[PDB]
Amino acid sequence: IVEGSDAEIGMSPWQVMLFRKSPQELLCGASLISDRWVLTAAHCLLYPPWDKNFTENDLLVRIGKHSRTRYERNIEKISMLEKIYIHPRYNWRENLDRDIALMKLKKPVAFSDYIHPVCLPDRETAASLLQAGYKGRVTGWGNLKETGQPSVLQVVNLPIVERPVCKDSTRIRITDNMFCAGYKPDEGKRGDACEGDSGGPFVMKSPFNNRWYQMGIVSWGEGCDRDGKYGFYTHVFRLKKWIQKVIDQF
C-alpha cells in the first residue's frame, strides 16, 4: 500500500496472507469469507506471461496476522489448501477479465478476535454502495512505493471512480466485471495498492446494517499511485453466481 497508514489491531480480521512455501515469501493478499473458504485474484495463482502457475501444494494461507514478517505465535493461524478454483473464463491473455479464484482450506479455521469473515454483497448492497465518489478500503502488506516493505498491515481508503474516467486513463479494454478507484490528480490526496497487495479485498461498510462487505478484489494497475492512473478491481457481486456455484457444488 502506497500512502496508507498502519492498520489498528483487529481492524481487518478477514485479511489473509498468501504465503509461498519455498522460497518463503509474500505472494498476494486474500480474504476470509467463511471458516473454510478464501477469496483472491486468479492472477495470484495463474499468469503464464510471468511464468506463474501455483498449485495447492505450493503455498500456505496465513490468517489473523498484523506483522508482515513475524510468526505471530498464539495469534495467527496457518492453513494448507485442499483445492483451488479459478474462474473458467478468467482472461489472462488480455485484460484480466474475471480475475477471481476460490481456495478451499484443508480444515476450518476457528474464529477469534483477530480472525473473522467479511460479508459478500447482495444485489441491493452493491447497487446502493457501488457509486462514484463513495469510498472503500484497501489493506495489504505490499510495497510502500512503486520503486520498501511495511512492518505491519497497511490501510488506505479510496473513492470509486466514474467509469468513463477509468476507461480514458488506460489503453487496456475494461469490462463490466471491473471498476477502478483512486484519487484524481487534482484531489490533493494519494493512495493505491501496490506489488504484494493484489488479490486483497476492497471493502465498504454498509450504513444500513453496519456490516463490512467486500465489493472488490485488488486486480490490476499500471504502476502504483501514478497521477492520472487508477487501480482496477474485480466486481465481486457481478461474479457472485460463480462463487455460490463453486461453494454449493464443492
Binding site: 471458516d35 473473522h116 460479508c119 450504513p207 453496519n210 456490516r211
Partner: peptide, 28 residues
C-alpha cells in the same frame, strides 16, 4: 456467515476504528 462483517474488536463492542468515519461520510 451469520455474523459476517461484524468485527470482534470494533462493531461487536460498539467501538469505531480511526478512519471508518471517512467512508461513511462519503456515502451521500
Amino acid at each position: 456467515e451469520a455474523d459476517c462483517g461484524l468485527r470482534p474488536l470494533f462493531e461487536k463492542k460498539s467501538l469505531e476504528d480511526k478512519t471508518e468515519r471517512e467512508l461513511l461520510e462519503s456515502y451521500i
